[PDB]
Assembly symmetry: D2
Homo-oligomer: 385 residues x 4
């Protein structure tokens, strides 16, 4: 189960770089130089890295220091063959963003947030990113009077429309992906799930420029089925990018390595990605626990990729098994894929077999045989065929 760059595995700088500060504790690890993380990840088989602005260039850096941090980074990517498929902006750490970036009540902050974003879009394009992520972790509220949500969605629409005007005016080939999260660090965050983000995109001026970057642990923080939300983003043609990690249920955002957390949801997610032929980056947005030293950081990053390749093998064995293909027909998955009424409305209304002479008792008595199918899926996951 050895990853190579063709598996398209990517990592944020801030993931292996997390120093382990939590709401209740100090850092347990020293800061890593981005150049060192590029080298170590390339040795483990990753394909590329991603960054917020402030991960790469320390906030407040002069133009001269900026160019230096970029030059060194670009040297490490040249040295290793690592790519940068995605970049994003930090609009959450600095105190100025305490009430949001794009939906801060202070108009001056909102203008600042857009300027900080556009500066990083130019950088991202220079480094070759194809996707620019937006996670508005400070957009929201702890109390009901602090944020009129209609006005806040007007502000959020306005910011995304201005960014889409900017990229089209520059002729850049970059698309945006909004990443939803239901809470933390705000009491409630706006666009809290993949569905809310999909719906909001349909009101932007140029919807084709925007998709979603859903994260496993975020949807599970609302108790939702992650594979079902990804199937809906795929159905809408909007899965531009994905963030992979693990989460044990509804609590703070744990960001465990991928495969930890809900392991059957991990299996059905890989099953769907590989069967729909998603071809974007498999990006890990995770935190090695603060119990770990540097050795434990690289072990946790390597288990992200390992677990994805094991689940890929298991899901492909499941769908290839003749006995599973038989059970899928026994449960009528083939019939779910056929149109209900390709005959059209009038024909359905005239069909006595659809109502007047439909035997509801006989149809009610047929079992779905779902539990036999699900135990075959369990046996395949566990290697117990």
């Amino acid at each position: 189960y050895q990853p190579t760059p063709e598996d398209r595995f990517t990592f944020g700088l801030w993931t292996v770089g997390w120093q382990g500060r939590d709401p209740f504790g100090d850092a347990t690890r020293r800061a890593l130089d981005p150049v060192e993380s590029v080298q170590r990840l390339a040795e483990l088989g990753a394909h590329g890295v991603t960054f917020h602005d402030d991960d790469l260039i320390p906030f407040g850096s002069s133009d001269s220091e900026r160019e230096e941090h970029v030059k060194r980074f670009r040297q490490a990517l040249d040295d290793t063959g690592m790519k940068v498929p995605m970049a994003t902006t930090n609009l959450f750490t600095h105190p100025v963003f305490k009430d949001g970036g794009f939906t801060a009540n202070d108009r001056d902050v909102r203008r600042y947030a857009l300027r900080k974003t556009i500066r990083n879009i130019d950088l991202a394009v220079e480094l070759g990113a194809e996707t620019y992520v937006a996670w508005g972790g400070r957009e929201g509220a702890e109390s009901g009077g602090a944020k009129d949500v209609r006005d806040a969605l007007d502000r959020m629409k306005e910011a995304f429309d201005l960014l889409g005007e900017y990229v089209t005016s520059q002729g850049y080939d970059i698309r945006f992906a909004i990443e939803p999260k239901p809470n933390e660090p705000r009491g409630d965050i706006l666009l809290p799930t993949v569905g809310h983000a999909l719906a909001f995109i349909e009101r932007l001026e140029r919807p084709e420029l925007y998709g979603v970057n859903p994260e496993v642990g975020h949807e599970q923080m609302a108790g939702l089925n992650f594979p079902h939300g990804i199937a809906q983003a795929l159905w809408a043609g909007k899965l531009f990018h994905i963030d992979l990690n693990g989460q044990n249920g509804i609590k703070y955002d744990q960001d465990l390595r991928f495969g930890a957390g809900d392991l059957r949801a991990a299996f059905w997610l890989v099953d769907l990605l590989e069967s729909a032929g998603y071809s974007g980056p498999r990006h890990f947005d995770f935190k090695p626990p603060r119990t770990e030293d540097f050795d434990g950081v690289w072990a946790s990053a390597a288990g992200c990729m390992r677990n994805y390749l094991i689940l890929k093998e298991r899901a492909a064995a499941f769908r290839a098994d003749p006995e599973v293909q038989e059970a899928l027909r026994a449960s009528r998955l083939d019939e779910l894929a056929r149109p209900t009424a390709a005959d059209g409305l009038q024909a359905l209304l005239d069909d006595r077999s659809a109502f007047e002479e439909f035997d509801v008792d006989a149809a009610a008595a047929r079992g779905m045989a779902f539990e036999r199918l699900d135990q075959l899926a369990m046996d395949h996951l566990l290697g117990a065929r």
Copy 2:
């Protein structure tokens, strides 16, 4: 706090009519005749009632019994002046719907579900309903292999498109409202939240015919902020109807009377409905607890309406208070309502005050004054000004 028919309070037949069967217990109350519930609700001040097909006409009724049940019902509405603003279909109780109605894997069941629905659309129009609700409580799965969600959304799109062809062909003035629920009775339900339902509507052939009917307890079953999801449905122009009740957090769907459950979320919901000028029915979809006799049923239905009118009074006193209007300006709610960059993109890019000379420390130091605003909201809710 006495309701009249002008407050537009409505109730489902199945709400005061719930006999108190739960997953662990037998009915504790006898069945009510719909005619008796119409009379009792009209005496309490309601404006109207709503129904599933099978609440009004017992499943399998002959054409003759059907006409009789409708005639008696119509007599009670004539006698009381009660209206029927909304109707819906039962596609969840009968065993035939064990795997869904519109997304059952069996194609024959899917055709049956559409025929059962269309028959009830004609009835609804005859009784004057303006909104037809769809709650697909059996659309979903307990296991990952039982439902390919992309094929299931194709089926769900197909069913809603056929219904929109039917109403337009008949020239009916009726719109559809999809009601999301994240789980129960299926392990996960498709379109589990208001955002997922809004996004799905944008892929239908005639999106203007469809909106949402969100329910308080359903969004809170995913830990989401109900007033924020309603603000997004209002922002999209899709709040066609609403279901009011109470829920204590993330657990089974309790359907407590409105005002029970999360009382501050109830306050901020009424604040939003009345300030956005929602003019649809205020419909209660609740269950008087099975501890109650008939007296306790009508007391619980009356407290639904009582609590709405108390919260309405408190939220109007809050927004009318000069000291609250001052605190709203102190927290920059006025600035949230102004465009971030009506000056346009180029102007924002040339503005040195938005970046190069923006004093981030001074802006970071300004407090939002949100806690004083929220305590004024608390004092107004409690009548403790």
Copy 3:
């Protein structure tokens, strides 16, 4: 992975017997005769069955019908060699129990609940049960004024003390196991978790007669770690019995077959049971989903046992692996098992190496190596060593 009676697998009559009535739907399967379930379970390799009173003898049966239902049941156990290690009382289905059994506000109901219980204790002893379970699913409240909890715990203590007087007076060899559940069907249930049940037992007159019967899905309905609650019940010497099933997070009680739900928690539960040498019944309290016919019922019951034996094999391979034993020492699990201060208090106070000369920076820098250990556990679960 074939079960035999020596694996001590047991099933409630109500589990394979569930007809599939849910809060939103009618039964999808016909009722099974207890004699048929005894035979089918014995063919699948189970060791025994359990029962509520009302599963075996229909509520209100005359003394003559009672003796007949028992005689037939006893014939099937003789025919198959099946045992009955546990029995319990239904104090939740009948409308009389709408506010509880032992903590109903009506004193007459509370006396009735005790009489119904004692009648079934005599039956249980006659059939050889060693454990009598109490699940007070109706003990609790939907609203704060309906139940004074101090008075309710006095009532609950009083009922359990009377039952312990009864068994000791009869000289029966039977112990009680209280089964906690946090909600459903009441809004909140008293003694909602294993910890609350352990604490309550310590106030009974004869605590040695009472332990816990925790259920996987119940603790996970509160978001708690099931293996950690079982380790605490084992530490207290009170794991008298256990109920095995699966649950996907915090929502209604799903009762999926064991291994479904949280599969890594299932692995660590089997690891603990087999390493602590629990020797009671491995009892399944699950519901075959209502999508299923009879074939799907027996498939789901068989996958309960299958999944337990696969996890047993995987956890034994994990603890036997020399490389895992090395990683356990690398993470200092051996040091967790040694006393912190067997030297005693004075010695600890005089030890300069514990404070004055303790190098906190060096100890802080040591990694715990937990992620390497957890990936070995993942590889062993998946058969990917």
Copy 4:
């Protein structure tokens, strides 16, 4: 609603002192000197303050700096008349505690944790505290193999037994209160709820020295009913102290001011505290949101106390209302307080009215009248009688 020192309102130094660092952001406020917080809180009407060791004396302070920080603090308490009823130890911030204090796998760390604790017990006694709190926020695990929970409870028992030997040997009049929390910052924390903490205390060598300090938001992080857990701690005689705050459901620990979050649970908590006559400190363990400046800090601290006094007034009006006392009898709360079988076991067994001639249908038909009672409670909370 003006607090005075006789209301016994207390605050941690770390609460108004929180600088607003969160997992995603930098501090938004400067550090406060403890002397300034003592003065400001005394002006708002508080009765006293509490502290962790490291809040008062910066970690690593020499003996000389230690004595200086204590002298200044003692001057401010003398100047204001503020008391210090409770103190606790920080065993969670420093990197050395990354795997726990009392249950760290490294034995050296466990000995260090006890020495750090005992040094602060002596300080606490010197300042007059009567309760010493233990919150083991780092005791737990992110993965199943990292912590054998039986060995960890042996270690936790050992540490608490050594502390109880120390206080008894010194002749101090100080009792311990364990504060449970279900997760955060560890993936799962040991003794995660009030019930688990009550049960654990019953295995200590001298149980009478130990009680609980439950926190509103902590039990609600497991979806549990806080007033019901406090009624059980009161029933056991173990409510030594309490921490008051607000939380919106199951998510990260928000620590909103008291009255925010679940306001009806706040009402029923004050109802219980004042009706059981709890006479300990009403301590607020909350964080003014990081959106706030210093003005917003003192406003949030003042609303904690305000909300408690409003709820106290409302709950006393509820229990004093003759119409409520009538409804309580209508719902048989008086009967819940009477023994079920003061007549004894034999008498219950011979009583034909408890079984053979008990009319279950008539008892089943009586309504509990709970919804009328709960609407009276709602009207009293809202001031809408």
